[PDB]
Design a protein around this ligand. Structure first.
Ligand SMILES: [Mg+2]
Ligand SMILES: [Mg+2]
Ligand SMILES: [Mg+2]
Ligand SMILES: [Mg+2]
Ligand SMILES: [Mg+2]
Ligand SMILES: [Mg+2]
Ligand SMILES: [Mg+2]
Ligand SMILES: [Mg+2]
Ligand SMILES: [Mg+2]
Ligand SMILES: [Mg+2]
Ligand SMILES: [Mg+2]
Ligand SMILES: [Mg+2]
Ligand SMILES: [Mg+2]
Ligand SMILES: [Mg+2]
Ligand SMILES: [Mg+2]
Ligand SMILES: [Mg+2]
Ligand SMILES: [Mg+2]
Ligand SMILES: [Mg+2]
Ligand SMILES: [Mg+2]
Ligand SMILES: [Mg+2]
Ligand SMILES: [Mg+2]
Ligand SMILES: [Mg+2]
Ligand SMILES: [Mg+2]
Ligand SMILES: [Mg+2]
Ligand SMILES: [Mg+2]
Ligand SMILES: [Mg+2]
Ligand SMILES: [Mg+2]
Ligand SMILES: [Mg+2]
Ligand SMILES: [Mg+2]
Ligand SMILES: [Mg+2]
Ligand SMILES: [Mg+2]
Ligand SMILES: [Mg+2]
Ligand SMILES: [Mg+2]
Ligand SMILES: [Mg+2]
Ligand SMILES: [Mg+2]
Ligand SMILES: [Mg+2]
Ligand SMILES: [Mg+2]
Ligand SMILES: [Mg+2]
Ligand SMILES: [Mg+2]
Ligand SMILES: [Mg+2]
Ligand SMILES: [Mg+2]
Ligand SMILES: [Mg+2]
Ligand SMILES: [Mg+2]
Ligand SMILES: [Mg+2]
Ligand SMILES: [Mg+2]
Ligand SMILES: [Mg+2]
Ligand SMILES: [Mg+2]
Ligand SMILES: [Mg+2]
Ligand SMILES: [Mg+2]
Ligand SMILES: [Mg+2]
Ligand SMILES: [Mg+2]
Ligand SMILES: [Mg+2]
Ligand SMILES: [Mg+2]
Ligand SMILES: [Mg+2]
Ligand SMILES: [Mg+2]
Ligand SMILES: [Mg+2]
Ligand SMILES: [Mg+2]
Ligand SMILES: [Mg+2]
Ligand SMILES: [Mg+2]
Lengths: 46, 62, 94, 77, 103
RNA sequence: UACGGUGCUGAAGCAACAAAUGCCCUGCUUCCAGGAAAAGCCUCUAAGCAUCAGGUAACAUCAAAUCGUACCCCAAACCG
RNA sequence: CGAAGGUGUGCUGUGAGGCAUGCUGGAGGUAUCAGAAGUGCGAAUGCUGACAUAAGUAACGAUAAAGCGGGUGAAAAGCCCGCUCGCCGGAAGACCAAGGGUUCCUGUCCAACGUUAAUCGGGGCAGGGUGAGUCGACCCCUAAGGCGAGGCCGAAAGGCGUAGUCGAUGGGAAACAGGUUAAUAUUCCUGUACUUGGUGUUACUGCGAAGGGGGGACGGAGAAGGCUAUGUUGGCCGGGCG
RNA sequence: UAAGGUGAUAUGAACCGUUAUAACCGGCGAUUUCCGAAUGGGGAAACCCAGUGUGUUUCGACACACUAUCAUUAACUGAAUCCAUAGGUUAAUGAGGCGAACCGGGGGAACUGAAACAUCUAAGUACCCCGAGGAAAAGAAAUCAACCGAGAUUCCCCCAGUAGCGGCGAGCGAACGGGGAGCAGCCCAGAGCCUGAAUCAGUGUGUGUGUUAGUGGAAGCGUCUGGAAAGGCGCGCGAUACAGGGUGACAGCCCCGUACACAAAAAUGCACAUGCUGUGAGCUCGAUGAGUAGGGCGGGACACGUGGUAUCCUGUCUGAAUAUGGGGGGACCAUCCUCCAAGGCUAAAUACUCCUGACUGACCGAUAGUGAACCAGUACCGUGAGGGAAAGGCGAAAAGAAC
């Protein structure tokens, strides 16, 4: 069957990437939460 | 060498830095092969380049 | 004019290999491990100055680092750059 | 923004209370209107989005005093 | 400000060699010394083709705590604790007994 | 000949027929549902420049950097 | 001269319990009288870990299919070489994009992985391997759309949007054949080409745009005609005479 | 400060050093790639592409600096449109982003409870947004009181679960007054007279006191058991040091320390003193914050749900007097008392702990305690936001088992 994850790095980075998070206010709050929790990989972006 | 190098000109320190960098190249290719059997010379050279760059920023612009 | 200090920091090591020995004895081409940010003109100037030898052409490629496991902890080696430096005919090098 | 430039009036929030005292949040907007005021010294018109209270203030104090207050406040006109 | 140093002659206070003497060969950063000829262990040394070792039961010296040794006072023939004083503006060692400067 | 290979040499190398969903064809015919944009490219002059700049024509010389390039890709290497 | 803890035994109390001691263990334990409680577990389709059971049972993943000799090796139904057999063949062959990211090649190992064994492997370990002016990206250009100086609007955050600037899936310069590596090749080599920019001379002399125009530049279906790829036969050459 | 070193797993190699530029610690410095507010333009973060200028060139080209936006100011320029203005450009200064809690403000729930539920509650709570400081806010009476008087603000204990509010239900819940912590008052709405006089800010200097490396630092032997003594048994000694930790079993006297005594080239905090710059001090005579108070309508805050409801705020419409005046004293009037709104500033007591140092615990002791004693916000899962583990101990010493 066709499963729900059909990967594409361009769409992955445009949707969940660093500059897509840094563009908006709420996306910057996402990066602030992951730094406070201490995530190693802060975003998707390679 | 900070006392020796302090008694030098800017062009003399630049000449020594270029002779150090040539020695650092010849050591790096020598240790690239298995020829170099004195590994401490790479460290001695890297410190002496840092001392020359320090004294150059002291004598010029300071 | 490319500066001599950069020309001294461009070249890292010669690369020993069966392919390097073949290209050295057949095509008169040496294989060098170079700095990663080094370009072809910097390599041609470095070999033409530090070895005083005539370079015909330089081909470059980037070597991707392997992923190794020391014990059970994962790790990754560094990406490094490789240069095929074709010397002109008659030129010789140790 | 529904803000009087002269008085600094602003939409405040309150409640609609029904007969059964059912409270729903509403807003109280100022009666803002854009009006061209003739400045006699500079001999020109200045458009101000001003409430009718502010128009009574301009009719009482004069437009030169108010535009002095708006420059001391740091407000464009 | 170390009391027991390298070329010092010490006596052993505790352990399987309570009373023996020897010279310190090197001091370790962990608060241990290697005293020449005292704390002997027999290591089963494995042969290596490189390094040319045949491999046997090598008897060699193990480290010991600095607390377990004291500097031997060769005058009195005993152990003395070590104090520090300034002579000529220079920090020297001396024996707590007889106030004699360690040399 | 390490039987894996490596070296040397090397004939003929034409014609007919059939023939594509590929090419001419971004064509031609026809229909209505009436079928992207911009740059490169060509050209026109504006201010400006006046015999300098620039233009094309030939020739010489120099440069063309950087990154990817292994391998699977229908699959035991992708999503399951 | 052996603590706690563990494991037995003996004794004792109405009971919760208590005491002594053997073995293990190898360093802490604690009377009494008071004090404070994370103070007592068999159940909560309780939570976590370990071990059973069914049970050495079901199954070992397309009914495309295997047989033999020799080799290696501790050992071969499965590996290698060989001869036969069978299967796909508009694919179960070959080349890529997306995606993965060293799975590529060589040597070595067989613990784990592999639904069996394994000397084998996309497994472990070490080393090696990806070569471009012409391929592609980058780059020039824009679509849908996004962002958006100013601006307009909005309690605030912010929303929309002008000039602009991004944005391919589309437009835009140029390389082919042969050979070669264990592994790369339109990238290396041999041969033969091509394009766009430069500087520099020489001849000639209207050059100039963010502007104007042209071009780029565009649909569906259908009909033939002309070709080629390619194939067949003949000829030709080499070998053969079962 | 030093006789030992070149961080760890993790040896080894090659070396350095031993009386002082070995190492180590601290102060001030130097360098400080790329991304990221990211700021030269773009961008799918750690990448792509420039422009201008000044320099070098072995003409191939190299190196360095600068170039974001907005606000404010100044200069120049500059439309329709004459002047002008908008606009443009240069230049200078500043901001931007991050961050635990506390704080002020703008918005603002519902589950729930009421044994249902709609007024009410939960609760101005959670949450979102904005701004600030080391604290913030508030603050020097148009206040209370009661005919006696008090004398800014904030905080604690009472008053008091009282008075009240309230489908008078559920529930919400003061104040006056009293005891305390802490205390500090001032200025402009304006002229003069005397003129720099108090105070504050900044910047120097000097002294003291800290902080950021450090130094000295007492006093035990014998014997028995035992693998090992710090234990047992004797005999001594120190203590302004018997806090604590380590050392082969439990050490005041083995070690590190502790009590105590000191110590800083350099940086820096805090006090004073004073220098300089700026600042004005005091006296006299005045002035006394208008679309404001108040009112009507609709809401909100006050313990007070419109009620007989004072007081405060304002979205809307209005609208005074002004020291011979006005506000309040819980509907309202009269008398009396008290105060002077429509301009501001102000320390302390108060709140909190991302972080640092010291110490403590009838706090845990590896299914506990942080999710994490261990390379844990990791492995792993998820497109993503996000979720989120398991896993400690040889021995005194590797002497980690030659053969
Ligand atoms: Mg390349
Ligand atoms: Mg409500
Ligand atoms: Mg000891
Ligand atoms: Mg390929
Ligand atoms: Mg295939
Ligand atoms: Mg026992
Ligand atoms: Mg027991
Ligand atoms: Mg027992
Ligand atoms: Mg216990
Ligand atoms: Mg319990
Ligand atoms: Mg039960
Ligand atoms: Mg249970
Ligand atoms: Mg079974
Ligand atoms: Mg059965
Ligand atoms: Mg059966
Ligand atoms: Mg079966
Ligand atoms: Mg099968
Ligand atoms: Mg067989
Ligand atoms: Mg088989
Ligand atoms: Mg076969
Ligand atoms: Mg078949
Ligand atoms: Mg078929
Ligand atoms: Mg691998
Ligand atoms: Mg393979
Ligand atoms: Mg086996
Ligand atoms: Mg197996
Ligand atoms: Mg493998
Ligand atoms: Mg392009
Ligand atoms: Mg573009
Ligand atoms: Mg657009
Ligand atoms: Mg804007
Ligand atoms: Mg927009
Ligand atoms: Mg494309
Ligand atoms: Mg291949
Ligand atoms: Mg055009
Ligand atoms: Mg069409
Ligand atoms: Mg043909
Ligand atoms: Mg026959
Ligand atoms: Mg180290
Ligand atoms: Mg930039
Ligand atoms: Mg940018
Ligand atoms: Mg409710
Ligand atoms: Mg409800
Ligand atoms: Mg209820
Ligand atoms: Mg304040
Ligand atoms: Mg009175
Ligand atoms: Mg000391
Ligand atoms: Mg001491
Ligand atoms: Mg013990
Ligand atoms: Mg007043
Ligand atoms: Mg009012
Ligand atoms: Mg009223
Ligand atoms: Mg109201
Ligand atoms: Mg009114
Ligand atoms: Mg009033
Ligand atoms: Mg009354
Ligand atoms: Mg006031
Ligand atoms: Mg345990
Ligand atoms: Mg835990």
């Amino acid at each position: 069957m066709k499963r729900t994850f059909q990967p594409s790095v361009l769409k992955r980075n445009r949707s969940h990437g660093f500059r897509a998070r840094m563009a908006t206010k709420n996306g910057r709050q996402v990066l602030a939460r992951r730094r406070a929790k201490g995530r190693a990989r802060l975003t998707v972006s390679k | 060498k900070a006392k020796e190098l302090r008694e030098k000109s800017v062009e003399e320190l630049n000449t020594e830095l270029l002779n150090l960098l040539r020695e650092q190249f010849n050591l790096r290719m020598q240790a690239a092969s298995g020829q170099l059997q004195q590994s401490h010379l790479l460290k001695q050279v890297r410190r002496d380049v840092a001392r020359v760059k320090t004294l150059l920023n002291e004598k010029a612009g300071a | 004019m490319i500066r001599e200090e950069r020309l001294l920091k461009v070249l890292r090591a010669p690369h020993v290999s069966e392919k390097a020995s073949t290209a050295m004895e057949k095509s008169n081409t040496i294989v060098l491990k170079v700095a990663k940010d080094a370009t072809k003109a910097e390599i041609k100037a470095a070999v033409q100055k530090l070895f005083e030898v005539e370079v015909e052409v330089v081909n470059t490629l980037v070597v991707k680092g392997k992923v190794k496991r020391h014990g059970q902890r994962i790790g990754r080696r560094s990406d490094w750059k490789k240069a095929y430096v074709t010397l002109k005919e008659g030129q010789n090098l140790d | 923004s529904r803000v009087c430039q002269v008085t600094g009036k602003r939409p405040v929030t309150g409640n609609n209370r029904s007969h059964a005292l059912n409270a729903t949040k509403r807003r109280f907007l100022p009666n803002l209107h854009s009006h061209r005021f003739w400045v006699e010294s500079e001999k020109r018109f200045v458009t101000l989005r001003v409430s009718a209270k502010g128009m009574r203030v301009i009719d009482k104090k004069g437009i030169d005093t108010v535009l002095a207050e708006l420059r001391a406040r740091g407000e464009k006109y | 400000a170390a009391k027991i140093r390298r070329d010092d002659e010490v006596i052993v206070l505790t352990g399987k060699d309570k009373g023996k003497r020897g010279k310190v060969k090197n001091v370790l950063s962990s608060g241990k010394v290697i005293v020449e000829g005292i704390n002997l262990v027999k290591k089963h040394q494995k042969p290596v083709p490189a390094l040319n070792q045949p491999g046997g039961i090598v008897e060699k010296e193990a480290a010991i705590q600095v607390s377990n040794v004291a500097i031997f006072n060769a005058a009195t023939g005993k152990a003395d604790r070590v104090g520090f004083r300034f002579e000529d503006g220079k920090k020297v060692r001396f024996f707590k007994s007889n106030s004699e400067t360690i040399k």
